Amino acid sequence: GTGVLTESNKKFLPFQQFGRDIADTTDAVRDPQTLEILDITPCSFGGVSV
Amino acid sequence: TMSLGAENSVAYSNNSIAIPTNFTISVTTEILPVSMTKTSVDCTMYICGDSTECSNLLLQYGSFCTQLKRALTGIAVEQDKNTQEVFAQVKQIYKTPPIKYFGGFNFSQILPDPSKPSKRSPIEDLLFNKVTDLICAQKFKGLTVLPPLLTDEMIAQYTSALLAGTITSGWTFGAGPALQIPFPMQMAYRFNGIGVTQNVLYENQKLIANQFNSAIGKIQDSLSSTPSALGKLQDVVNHNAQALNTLVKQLSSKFGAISSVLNDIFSRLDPPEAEVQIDRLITGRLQSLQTYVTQQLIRAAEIRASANLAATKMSECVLGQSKRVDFCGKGYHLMSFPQSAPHGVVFLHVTYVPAQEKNFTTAPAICHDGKAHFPREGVFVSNGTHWFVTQRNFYEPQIITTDNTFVSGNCDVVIGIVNNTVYDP
Amino acid sequence: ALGKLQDVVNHNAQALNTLVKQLSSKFGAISSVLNDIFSRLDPPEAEVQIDRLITGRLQSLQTYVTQQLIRAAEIRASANLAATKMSECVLGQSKRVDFCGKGYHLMSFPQSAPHGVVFLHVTYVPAQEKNFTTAPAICHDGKAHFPREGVFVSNGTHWFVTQRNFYEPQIITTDNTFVSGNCDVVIGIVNNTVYDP
Amino acid sequence: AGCLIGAEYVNNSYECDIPIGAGICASYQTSQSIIAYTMSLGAENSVAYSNNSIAIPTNFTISVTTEILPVSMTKTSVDCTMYICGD
Ligand SMILES: *[C@@H]1O[C@H](CO)[C@@H](O)[C@H](O)[C@H]1NC(C)=O
Ligand SMILES: *[C@@H]1O[C@H](CO)[C@@H](O)[C@H](O)[C@H]1NC(C)=O
Ligand SMILES: *[C@@H]1O[C@H](CO)[C@@H](O)[C@H](O)[C@H]1NC(C)=O
Ligand SMILES: *[C@@H]1O[C@H](CO)[C@@H](O)[C@H](O)[C@H]1NC(C)=O
Ligand SMILES: *[C@@H]1O[C@H](CO)[C@@H](O)[C@H](O)[C@H]1NC(C)=O
Ligand SMILES: *[C@@H]1O[C@H](CO)[C@@H](O)[C@H](O)[C@H]1NC(C)=O
Ligand SMILES: *[C@@H]1O[C@H](CO)[C@@H](O)[C@H](O)[C@H]1NC(C)=O
Ligand SMILES: *[C@@H]1O[C@H](CO)[C@@H](O)[C@H](O)[C@H]1NC(C)=O
Ligand SMILES: *[C@@H]1O[C@H](CO)[C@@H](O)[C@H](O)[C@H]1NC(C)=O
Ligand SMILES: *[C@@H]1O[C@H](CO)[C@@H](O)[C@H](O)[C@H]1NC(C)=O
Ligand SMILES: *[C@@H]1O[C@H](CO)[C@@H](O)[C@H](O)[C@H]1NC(C)=O
Ligand SMILES: *[C@@H]1O[C@H](CO)[C@@H](O)[C@H](O)[C@H]1NC(C)=O
Numbered sequence A: 001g002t003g004v005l006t007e008s009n010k011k012f013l014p015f016q017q018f019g020r021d022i023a024d025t026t027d028a029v030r031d032p033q034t035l036e037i038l039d040i041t042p043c044s045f046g047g048v049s050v
Numbered sequence B: 001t002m003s004l005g006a007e008n009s010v011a012y013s014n015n016s017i018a019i020p021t022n023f024t025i026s027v028t029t030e031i032l033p034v035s036m037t038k039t040s041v042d043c044t045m046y047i048c049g050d051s052t053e054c055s056n057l058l059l060q061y062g063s064f065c066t067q068l069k070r071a072l073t074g075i076a077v078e079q080d081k082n083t084q085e086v087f088a089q090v091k092q093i094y095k096t097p098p099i100k101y102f103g104g105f106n107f108s109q110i111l112p113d114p115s116k117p118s119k120r121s122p123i124e125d126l127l128f129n130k131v132t133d134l135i136c137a138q139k140f141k142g143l144t145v146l147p148p149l150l151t152d153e154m155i156a157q158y159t160s161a162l163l164a165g166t167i168t169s170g171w172t173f174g175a176g177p178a179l180q181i182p183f184p185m186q187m188a189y190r191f192n193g194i195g196v197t198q199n200v201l202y203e204n205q206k207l208i209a210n211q212f213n214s215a216i217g218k219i220q221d222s223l224s225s226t227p228s229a230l231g232k233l234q235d236v237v238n239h240n241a242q243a244l245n246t247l248v249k250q251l252s253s254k255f256g257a258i259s260s261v262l263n264d265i266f267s268r269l270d271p272p273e274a275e276v277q278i279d280r281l282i283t284g285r286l287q288s289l290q291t292y293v294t295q296q297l298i299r300a301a302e303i304r305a306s307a308n309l310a311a312t313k314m315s316e317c318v319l320g321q322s323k324r325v326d327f328c329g330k331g332y333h334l335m336s337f338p339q340s341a342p343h344g345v346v347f348l349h350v351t352y353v354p355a356q357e358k359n360f361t362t363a364p365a366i367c368h369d370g371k372a373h374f375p376r377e378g379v380f381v382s383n384g385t386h387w388f389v390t391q392r393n394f395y396e397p398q399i400i401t402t403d404n405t406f407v408s409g410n411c412d413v414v415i416g417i418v419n420n421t422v423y424d425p
Numbered sequence C: 001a002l003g004k005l006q007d008v009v010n011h012n013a014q015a016l017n018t019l020v021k022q023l024s025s026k027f028g029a030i031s032s033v034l035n036d037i038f039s040r041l042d043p044p045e046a047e048v049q050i051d052r053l054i055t056g057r058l059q060s061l062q063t064y065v066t067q068q069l070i071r072a073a074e075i076r077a078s079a080n081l082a083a084t085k086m087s088e089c090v091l092g093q094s095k096r097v098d099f100c101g102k103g104y105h106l107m108s109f110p111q112s113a114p115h116g117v118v119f120l121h122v123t124y125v126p127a128q129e130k131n132f133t134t135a136p137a138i139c140h141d142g143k144a145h146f147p148r149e150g151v152f153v154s155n156g157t158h159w160f161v162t163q164r165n166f167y168e169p170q171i172i173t174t175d176n177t178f179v180s181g182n183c184d185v186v187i188g189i190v191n192n193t194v195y196d197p
Numbered sequence D: 001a002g003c004l005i006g007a008e009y010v011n012n013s014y015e016c017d018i019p020i021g022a023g024i025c026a027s028y029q030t031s032q033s034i035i036a037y038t039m040s041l042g043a044e045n046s047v048a049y050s051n052n053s054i055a056i057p058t059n060f061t062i063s064v065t066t067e068i069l070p071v072s073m074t075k076t077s078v079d080c081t082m083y084i085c086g087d
Helices: B043-047 B052-061 B064-086 B122-128 B152-168 B183-194 B198-203 B205-225 B227-252 B262-268 B271-318 C003-021 C034-040 C043-090 D080-084
Strands: B016-033 B092-094 B332-341 B344-361 B371-375 B379-382 B387-390 B405-410 C104-113 C116-133 C143-147 C151-154 C159-162 C177-182 D018-021 D024-029 D033-038 D043-045 D053-064 D067-070
Touching: B016 B205, B016 B227, B016 B271, B016 B379, B043 B052, B043 B064, B043 B271, B052 B262, B052 B271, B064 B271, B092 B152, B122 B152, B122 B205, B122 B332, B122 B344, B152 B271, B152 B332, B183 B198, B183 B205, B183 B332, B198 B205, B198 C143, B198 C177, B205 B227, B205 B344, B227 B271, B262 B271, B271 B332, B271 B344, B271 C043, C003 C043, C003 D067, C034 C043, C043 C104, C043 C116, C043 D067, C043 D080, C151 D053
Parallel strands: B092 D043
Antiparallel strands: B016 B344, B332 B344, B344 B379, B371 B405, B379 B387, C104 C116, C116 C151, C116 D053, C116 D067, C143 C177, C151 C159, D018 D024, D024 D033
16 A cells, blocks of 8 residues: 555554554554554645635 | 423403513523534545555546535535624624723623633633544545634624624614614613513613623523533534544445455455456445435535524524514513524523513403593503503503593493593693 | 526536436446447346446436435425515515615515526615714603603704604604603603693 | 645735635735735724714615525436436
8 A cells, every 4th residue: 555654652562463443444564574563644635726 | 201391270361460560681592503514525535545456447437526526515615605694794893892881781791801812702612612533534534624714713703793783783783884872772672672661671770780690690600500501513513523433434344345455455356356346345435425425415404404594593683673482582582692602603682571470450441431441552450449551561550641542432332341530631 | 696596507407417427437337338238248147237337327316316305405495485585575564684685674576587586675774874962861840751752862952852763853842752750760861851732 | 724825825804705714715916916815804893882872864775685586496307218228
């Protein structure tokens, strides 16, 4: 997918690898190489009115 | 078994009448929704976000996105027009004079306070403090909230201008130019509009001012005591919140497919047979969004009906004195004061209510010299031995003279004619 | 000016154009032509391709019907409002403020229009105001005199009685005011002599 | 409401012509350019209120206004066979 990656303050558990939301879309992930919980936020979007 | 109220049996007689001897002004409150929450959905991001193949596959499903965007834009324009059809009824912003002595009535609880930053009255502060992470998850899925055109400060200024025009002028600033007039004279006119004469207002000005101040002070605590008092405005907020929540949760359904994530299908399955799994999700989400839109249409229609009712009440109860029974308050409507509230308007109706009634003996007419005498404006009552004439809303016994009654025919056809001598000055 | 009538026609035209354009979509199928699908596919499996178009068109027509019902709701509301105004503004004289025109309603004239009605409200608006010194009441022989129908005004030295909507100065006489009590309770009563014919 | 590119935020408040949002509206004013500004609710007025002053009108004006009200729509009937099963 597409989105911005930012270091999150979410305190994951040693066995938890992903993180869901109300719409079961993955919000946070764990980098398999280096143990660090990220925060997948969607790309910047909006509306254009002329 | 629920009770239908108390049980009263008023005595009906062909000679007994009940005349009120005092009165009370009651400040009732009425809440009316005006605007709604303008919501705009992103078609692509809601149906399938962060996906380039679905962004091309959605184009072959008709132009439903344009229809939904047009419907939402129409709803937004209607909700913006509702805020101007109710509050923006005057084209001249009035200002309260520095001297706030209006005969004895204290409007400090409804006039704006320059101490606080927001130019809101003490009642508007309670109205805004009682109508209340979840707004960022819906933002990341396509659902955004558009800000209203008229901010809260502009609605507060409109309400303050309407209040100043009602206090200083009365009903002249709604018809034409704002004609200045003292507030006791305005109250005398309000009393004459319901039948009571000006002497009751001018001889009991202090008592009426004290009753108005007491009712205004009690309204402030009555609005804060009952929690569900401001429920007619919180219900719309809860409805739109749950309508957005269920619209977000509908993305957690498979609609007969193998999964709810498109990246999970495009990665494992090849495009040949991934269409039969992506089209089901697309159709389900499009139908869910269409149901959301067709429900918000009915909701916006109901909000528009409520806003039209509120505008008619603002035009009839605030800009004038409406004689419609049970329209500008329960009882004899005297005046009304508008206040802003989150997505709504609160009308404080000051209403005249008789009290402390007393029973007297009445008669249709009296006969002095073989001719009947009917009351010109009032009713004939009796104290047991003497006869007087008094108005129909306040016990004010006066001697029966040729100015208070008129002669019409002989006193042998009226059923209930009594003999009594009239006075001639 | 005639924007409240052209918007309905525009909405109906847009709804009809959308219902027509909904026939050129595939609804997930391979094309939007029925005979093309019937001539390029076999009858056994052409059903799973034609049922999608059938359901799409049926849902589009049902959405059109629901939107027409929603629009007819507010159209009926506006028609009821117009009927109430025709009954109150044309068939009589309504005292409702900002209902039969901005101001003191005098009369109304109806006119027809394409799918609508135009009300020309002949209304009364005061103008050229002037400031005067008013008083709640007056007492001549120790008894207060309250205006029967009008208001006491002053021109600096003399006192007159005028109506609440037009400046018509009249001498304060007996048949223009009523006596009730003495001038010891009214706040702001001024002494002035009354006339008796 | 967002980020506006193409208009200069002026301080003099005028009447709202093109509603943008949050009290900000756009207009095309003087060369020529598009400006954005906070809308004005109306002209400020101060009624000379007093405990003994009144305002009496000395003349009047008959004004004929115009109010439009829709009545009905275009009655539309749809045929299933001709719409769905075209030939
Ligand atoms: C992955 O392997 C590389 C090379 O051995 C090593 O430098 C790196 O630290 C490893 N990362 C981890 C912590 O798994
Ligand atoms: C009228 O009611 C008020 C408030 O209850 C009271 O103070 C006053 O004495 C009453 N007057 C009469 C006519 O009894
Ligand atoms: C108005 O009411 C408030 C609260 O009771 C009080 O503090 C204030 O002094 C009153 N003002 C007047 C005009 O007496
Ligand atoms: C009038 O008489 C009826 C019947 O006795 C009684 O119920 C009512 O309270 C009386 N009203 C007054 C207070 O005079
Ligand atoms: C009736 O009114 C007259 C005049 O006020 C008074 O003299 C008389 O005592 C009253 N009688 C009764 C029965 O109230
Ligand atoms: C009223 O008085 C007349 C005589 O003046 C008499 O004939 C008649 O019976 C009286 N009626 C009543 C109501 O007593
Ligand atoms: C009355 O006084 C006000 C305030 O000075 C003024 O604006 C208004 O024009 C005056 N009306 C007339 C013409 O007497
Ligand atoms: C007030 O009106 C009276 C009667 O028309 C007139 O004689 C008097 O001069 C007027 N005074 C002023 C100052 O207008
Ligand atoms: C009104 O007249 C009385 C008696 O003539 C007098 O005592 C009082 O001071 C006068 N008041 C005014 C308003 O001039
Ligand atoms: C407009 O007002 C702002 C805030 O006071 C100020 O910073 C800015 O310089 C003003 N611009 C003009 C055109 O004077
Ligand atoms: C009457 O109003 C003026 C301001 O116009 C004020 O200064 C004065 O105190 C008020 N008089 C009374 C009766 O309080
Ligand atoms: C009333 O207004 C009309 C129109 O402006 C004017 O011709 C007429 O002279 C005015 N009359 C008065 C009383 O000033």
